[PDB]
Design a protein around this nucleic acid. Structure first.
Lengths: 36, 214, 190, 93, 105, 110
RNA sequence: AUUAAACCUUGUACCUUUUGCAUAAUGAACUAACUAGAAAACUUCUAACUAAAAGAAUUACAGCUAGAAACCCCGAAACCAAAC
């Protein structure tokens, strides 16, 4: 029931990305790890 | 005239008898009227609470029956869902179950949660009197009353105990670990103590039962 | 419909967080808000400064004319800080001028006046008082506390401090807390 | 996904009700009753599993034998087909 | 992350240590429950270590409010206006003592 | 016609003249009057134990716990049992009367 | 990183699969839900009792009783019966 928060955790680090990457969980997660 | 009780069975020589204050419910201040002796092998057993823990699980889970079911692909007009009624019944060893009840008795007595009474007779059947007396004697929020047999239990107590949710009255044969744990303090009649001791002390020896005792 | 009460409660907190960001609450002074003890704060305030204050005098210094009007207005439906205010402002002017002269005797009197005025400016006094939590301890009928009222209390507290601890301790307090603000300040800047 | 915008109705549970308060009473019938009645005799439920437990195949097989004479033709045929699939998996794999 | 995170320069509140050091923490609020496993460590802390800290640091206002509470919480307020809240849910006495000391520093 | 008596506190403080009251109860015992080995007198007798303990509890106000009953073999622990104080003050109550510093505030919301 | 969004500097999309390699090759417009490891004969471990153990059917020259501990999903070409 907390899957939304899991998505939010990735989203908070991907808010500053550009394009569909910043809004697609499939792409946002990959970018967040690469940035770290 | 103090009411003095002694253990019917032979107490071990190396173990001294256990004693407690005999009480009566006739009056508010009739807290102490006699002194009774308790068998150490029953009321002074080792504090093995895991047996009590196991008994509680056995008590709850031996009656458990789950009716959850789901249809598989072949039954559709869940891959690993519940399938029909399921039973969880199992039996603990008889000796362990007897020991668990013994351990519970020691815990209540050592914790000052057990109150030995001569009889359950009450001057009045009003539930208010029973609750107030418990307050006077600093009994717990929940008090369990045990009598030797259901048929002979006093009428006055039945009316009060029946109408009290937190004060429950059960017969001696109905005693169990779950109720004792659920109830803060236990009230036991003198005959009930003798009744309980005989069965518990009878467990000695094996002479394995070649057939069920039914 | 997703079942459960914990999940529904969790979303309520999520809604509250969004609501707080969208509509920040109006500012209110800590005095009105719960868990506030003026006596305890004053005792802690004095202990934190490692300075001795006369509780009665300090309360008078914090008391403001505007605050009294609100109480009187409420009463219709108490000592001002003016006397203490004058002592601190007047003493500070002499003491502040004394600091400038000793280091820079050559500097003209006119220059010292500009330096003293800047160091005693409402913004300078307001900045020190607000960062010192004095605003929370200030007694006034309006929040945020008006700067001129805040400035009055600051010098008023100085007057109370002089009586409680004498000029010597106050002078060190002024040097430690006010003269420090001139660090990094160029002459023509002030 | 999207989640409820309202809280579920409050639930109040009485832990000292007759059912919960008196749960388990007479579970010591055997020891306190001279073992005349075994505690397994106190099990209430389907007839084929009163005082007995087994795996699903055993439970289904026991159910068929107990009420096979009272089982519906459609139900009996369906049970047989399901048992056939279960038998191969357990007894050959 | 640095590109996605803010940064600042070295600074002091009001040159705190030039004349005399002032403790930033000004007020502490503690919520406790009479009967709660989470508050057991906090329960013992009040019995033993709360007094010592108050004597050591008498300039911080301490509020202790035992009340029916699901999760015990500690709130710390600073002079500059910073307010920090720490959950004491199921934390030991030693953990609590270290945390408060860190908050004061 | 049955009226419950008011609840009594569980706090018992040893009397200042504990020995005087103690020896008074020992005198109450049949002819003992502080005899030889008085502290070592055995309490195994049920009737003597009942009379001695019951009288002491009413006057002194402290009663032997049922769990601690069997330890009361001889007088020595009876005197010790009565001389140890019992306090009903709560931990919060004791903490309140512990010279709280001015910066420590306690509020009881229960 | 930065005073500064962009400039300067660094860095050969992801899963699977090939060799522990892809500048190979498969699959993916995106969003939301749904979507794949299941059994106790014996052993170790936790306890009850002990030349006995188990509430009948079992094992035994320390055994015996109870408890806990395990092994997926989707997808053919086909084959046969009975109707249409």
């Amino acid at each position: 029931t907390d899957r939304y928060w899991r998505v939010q955790e990735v989203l908070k680090h991907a808010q500053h990305f550009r394009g569909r990457k910043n809004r697609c969980y499939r792409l946002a997660v990959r970018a967040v790890t690469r940035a770290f | 005239d103090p009411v003095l009780r002694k253990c019917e069975l032979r107490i071990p020589v190396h173990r001294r008898p256990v004693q407690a204050w005999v009480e009566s419910l006739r009056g508010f201040e009739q807290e102490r009227i006699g002194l009774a002796e308790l068998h150490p092998d029953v009321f002074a057993t080792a504090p093995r609470l895991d047996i009590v823990h196991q008994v509680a699980i056995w008590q709850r889970n031996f009656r458990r029956i789950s009716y959850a079911n789901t249809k598989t692909r072949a039954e559709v007009s869940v891959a690993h869902g519940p399938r029909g009624p399921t039973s969880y019944y199992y039996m603990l060893p008889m000796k362990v179950r007897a020991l668990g009840l013994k351990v519970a008795l020691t815990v209540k007595l050592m914790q000052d949660d057990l109150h030995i009474v001569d009889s359950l007779e009450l001057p009045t059947a009003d539930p208010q009197y029973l609750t107030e007396l418990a307050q006077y004697r600093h009994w717990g929020s929940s008090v369990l009353l045990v009598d030797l047999t259901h048929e002979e239990m006093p009428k006055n107590v039945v009316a009060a105990t029946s109408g009290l949710n937190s004060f429950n009255l059960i017969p001696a044969v109905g005693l169990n670990v779950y109720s004792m744990l659920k109830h803060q303090t236990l009230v036991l009649t003198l005959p009930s103590v003798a009744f309980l001791e005989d069965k518990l002390l009878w467990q000695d020896s094996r002479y394995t039962p070649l057939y069920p005792f039914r | 419909v997703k079942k459960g009460f914990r999940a529904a409660f969790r979303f309520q907190k999520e809604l509250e967080r969004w609501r707080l960001l969208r509509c920040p609450p109006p500012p209110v002074r800590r005095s009105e808000k719960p868990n506030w003890d003026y006596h305890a704060e004053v005792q802690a305030f004095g202990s934190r400064l490692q300075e001795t204050f006369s509780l009665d005098l300090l309360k008078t210094a914090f008391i403001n004319s505007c605050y009294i009007k609100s109480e009187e207005a409420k009463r219709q439906s108490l000592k001002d800080n003016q006397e203490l205010f004058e002592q601190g402002l007047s003493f500070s002017h002499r003491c502040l001028t004394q600091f400038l002269e000793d280091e820079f005797p050559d500097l003209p009197a006119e220059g010292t006046e500009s330096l003293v005025s800047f160091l005693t400016g409402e913004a300078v006094v307001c900045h020190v008082a607000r960062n010192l939590a004095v605003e929370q301890l200030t007694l006034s009928a309006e929040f945020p506390v008006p700067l001129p009222v805040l400035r009055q209390t600051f010098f008023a507290v100085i007057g109370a401090l002089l009586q409680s601890s004498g000029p010597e301790r106050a002078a060190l307090f002024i040097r430690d807390f006010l003269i420090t603000q001139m660090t990094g300040k160029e002459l023509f800047e002030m | 996904a999207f989640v409820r915008l309202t809280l579920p109705p409050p639930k109040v549970v009485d832990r000292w009700n007759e059912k919960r308060a008196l749960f388990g009473v007479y579970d010591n019938i055997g020891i306190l009753g001279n073992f005349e009645k075994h505690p397994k005799e106190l099990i209430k439920g389907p007839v084929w599993l009163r005082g007995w437990r087994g795996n699903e195949l055993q439970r289904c097989v026991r159910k068929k034998k107990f009420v096979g004479n009272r089982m519906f033709i459609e139900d009996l045929h369906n049970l047989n087909k399901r048992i056939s699939y279960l038998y191969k998996h357990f007894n050959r794999h | 992350t640095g590109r996605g995170t803010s940064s600042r320069f070295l600074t002091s509140v009001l040159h705190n240590g030039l004349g005399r050091y002032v403790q930033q923490l000004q007020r502490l609020s503690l919520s406790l429950s009479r009967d709660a496993p989470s508050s057991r460590g906090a329960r013992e802390f009040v019995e033993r270590e709360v007094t010592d800290f108050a004597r050591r640091n008498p300039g911080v206002v301490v509020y202790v409010n035992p009340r029916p509470c699901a999760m015990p919480r500690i709130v710390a307020e600073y002079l500059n206006g910073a307010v920090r809240e720490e959950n004491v849910n199921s934390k030991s006495v030693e953990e609590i003592k270290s945390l408060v000391q860190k908050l004061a520093d | 016609v049955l009226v419950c008596p008011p609840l009594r506190s569980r706090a018992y403080t040893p009397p200042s003249d504990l020995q005087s009251r103690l020896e008074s109860h020992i005198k109450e015992v049949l002819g003992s009057s502080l005899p030889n080995n008085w502290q070592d007198i055995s309490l195994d007798d049920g009737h003597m134990k009942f009379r001695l303990l019951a009288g002491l509890a009413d006057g002194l106000g402290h009663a032997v716990p049922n769990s601690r009953l069997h330890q009361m073999c001889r007088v020595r622990d009876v005197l010790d049992f009565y001389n140890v104080p019992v306090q009903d003050k709560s931990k919060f109550d004791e903490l309140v009367a512990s010279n709280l510093p001015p910066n420590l505030k306690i509020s009881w919301s229960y």
